[PDB]
Amino acid sequence: MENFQKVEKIGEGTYGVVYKARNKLTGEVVALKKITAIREISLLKELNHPNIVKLLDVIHTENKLYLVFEFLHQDLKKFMDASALTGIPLPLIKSYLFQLLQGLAFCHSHRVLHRDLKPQNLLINTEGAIKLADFGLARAFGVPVRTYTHEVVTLWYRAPEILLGCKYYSTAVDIWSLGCIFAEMVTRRALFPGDSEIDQLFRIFRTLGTPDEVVWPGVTSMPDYKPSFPKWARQDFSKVVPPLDEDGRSLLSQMLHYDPNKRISAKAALAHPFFQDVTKPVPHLRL
Numbered sequence: 001m002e003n004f005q006k007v008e009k010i011g012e013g014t015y016g017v018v019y020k021a022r023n024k025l026t027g028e029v030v031a032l033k034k035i036t037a038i039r040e041i042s043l044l045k046e047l048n049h050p051n052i053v054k055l056l057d058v059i060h061t062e063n064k065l066y067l068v069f070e071f072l073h074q075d076l077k078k079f080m081d082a083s084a085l086t087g088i089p090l091p092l093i094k095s096y097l098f099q100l101l102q103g104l105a106f107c108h109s110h111r112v113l114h115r116d117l118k119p120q121n122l123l124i125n126t127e128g129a130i131k132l133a134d135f136g137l138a139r140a141f142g143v144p145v146r147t148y149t150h151e152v153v154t155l156w157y158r159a160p161e162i163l164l165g166c167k168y169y170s171t172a173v174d175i176w177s178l179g180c181i182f183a184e185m186v187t188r189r190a191l192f193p194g195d196s197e198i199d200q201l202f203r204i205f206r207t208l209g210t211p212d213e214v215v216w217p218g219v220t221s222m223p224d225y226k227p228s229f230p231k232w233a234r235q236d237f238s239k240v241v242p243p244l245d246e247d248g249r250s251l252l253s254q255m256l257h258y259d260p261n262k263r264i265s266a267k268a269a270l271a272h273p274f275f276q277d278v279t280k281p282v283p284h285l286r287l
C-alpha cells in the first residue's frame, strides 16, 4: 500500500514477509504483514487487550491482503538467546507468564484460540510488558506444514491432542504451549524439541509418560493413537525444570496435564499460589 513507508524487513512469518513500516498519514511505526477469512479477521480487530498485539488495520487489495499491527521492539526468542548466559531472572519470568495468562484468559473468554504459540510470537517492550501476536490467524488461514518460504513450522509447542489427530481442540492447546514456553524460559532449553510429528509425540511420552486410559480417559480411541506406541514411565518433575521451586513446578504440572479437560484454564492459573508475589520488573533491553 501507498500509505506506508517500509523501514526494514523484520522477518518471515508463516503466511508472508513482515516489515517494519511508518504510516505516512498518522506517522505511526507499525508491523506490516503481507498474507470467511475476511469475516474472521474483522472479528479479531475488535478483541483488544493490553497483552494482545493490537490489530490496527486490514487492507485487502487486488486479492492481496495486508495486516497492520502495533509494533514492538523485540521477540521472546531473541530475548531468551540474549539472557542465555545468566538466565532471565525469576521475577521477570513470573511477570511474563502472568501477563500471558491474562491475555489467554481474555481471548479464551471470547472463544478465540491462538493454536500456534511460540517464543517468536511473544513480543516485549522496554516497560516490562509482553503481548501475544498473531492470535486467531490459524483459524482464519490455518496452519501449514511449511511456511511461504518452505521453512519448517515448529512442532515444539504442539499439544498432544493435536498430534493424536483430534479435529476439535479447545483453548487447552494454548495452555499446553505456554507451559512449554514457561519451562524453556526457566531451563534455557526447549522442553520438547521434536523434529517430526512422531518424534514430538515420543519426546512428550518419554518425559511425561505414555498416556493411558487411567490418566487420559479416551486417549486410546484417538484417531492417530496406536496400541504399538512404546510405553515409557513418567519422569519426576524435579528432574524436569530444575531448579524451579515447588509452586512453579506445581503450576507447570497443571499446565501439562494430558487430559485437556483437566488441564488448568488460564483463569484458574492466574489464581495459583505461584503468583502471590508477582511483580512487574523491566527487562534489560538493548535495542
Ligand SMILES: Nc1cc(Nc2ccc(S(N)(=O)=O)cc2)ncn1
Binding pocket: 010, 018, 031, 053, 069, 070, 071, 072, 073, 074, 075, 076, 078, 079, 123, 133
Ligand atoms: N510480528 C510482529 C513483530 C514485531 N516486531 C518485532 C518482532 C521481532 C523482532 S526481533 N527478531 O528483533 O526480536 C523485532 C521487532 N511487532 C509486531 N508484530
